[model samples]
Target: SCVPGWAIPHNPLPSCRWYVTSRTCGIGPRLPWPELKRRCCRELADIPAYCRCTALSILMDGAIPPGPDAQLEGRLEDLPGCPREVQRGFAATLVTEAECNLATISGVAECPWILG
Candidate 1:
């Protein structure tokens, strides 16, 4: 039920491939690969585990990752323009990744920063 965007004539639903493991189900939605990569990377830059491959997979399929992996659960209030589902998924991934990374950071005293 994902509808492809009209902006991209070549591929309205370019990301359909990730979910389409078999031809029987056919393509879901097409997303402009370039745009998708750019946007996804921009959104995922904060997360370390989301390399190009993993990000691409996340964009294509609505799968929630486990462990240190990111989960897509973005909030509509923040990214109202993005596809609701995609945004939700991406946001979830970012939040989880951020929390994991935050856990590793040591005390602020180690960095030696002065509070004004």
Candidate 2:
């Protein structure tokens, strides 16, 4: 039930994979890769538009550097003309990954729009 050319067996949902596994997190792995992949598939299943090649390029290759420094500029809302599904998928990943942070000074806050 996934779009063609977007399926990675380890992460069948490309958008979800881009969100969770991309360098954007910078905090290292949080959830088990399997669990993260599964969630992404389920959570983003309806948003097929977000799983397309263009959206994946935006999410994974947009050149948003990793770490707190990368947060503000890459926030989904900042990507003008992006699909709502893409924005929503990326936003969900940012917020969820933020929750996985154990540090007191987490990068989550740097992504202010994650909760917005």
Candidate 3:
């Protein structure tokens, strides 16, 4: 465990299943690629970087759906590439919504504990 309150809401592994199970590679994903990206992004919207990183490991590394075309099958790697932007957008949202001290975007990237 990363710590209490650090666990992602519900199971991070299961949270990302939709991103993998909805796609077929060559035939294209049964779910639209943009929407797939959007959904995963939605999952990580307010998620902290620690669990965000873990969720991605579970998601991008999950089961391989057969498509033989290589277009969308192994593509969860590309889809769950959601957190760089997750850190980006949520950093601003944190400032506006939660009011953590401003360290620019790089502040929280460093850590979230208060000065002791």
TM-score for each model: 0.21, 0.28, 0.36
What value does the lDDT take at residue 44 in candidate 2?
Answer: 37
**lDDT tens per residue, model 3, 1-116:** 42223454433433235543443222234677666646555665455655544434434433233356422221133334343323322322222223222222243423232111
Clashing residue pairs for model 2: none
Report the error of model 1 at residue 24, Å: 22
Candidate 2 per-residue lDDT over residues 17-61, each given as its tens digit = 444433334322466665665565554333343233323334333
User: Which one is best on TM-score?
Assistant: 3
Worst 10 residues of 2 by lDDT: 100-109
lDDT over C-alpha atoms for residue 109 of model 3 = 29
Q: Model 1: per-residue lDDT, tens digit, 9-36? A: 1121233232221122322236554544
Off by over 4 Å in 1: 1-39, 49-51, 64-116
Show model 3 residue runs off by greater than 4 Å: 1-6, 13-15, 22-30, 60-116
- On the 0 to 100 scale, the lDDT of residue 82 in model 3 is 46
- lDDT of every model, 2 decimals: 0.30, 0.37, 0.38
* lDDT top scorer: 3
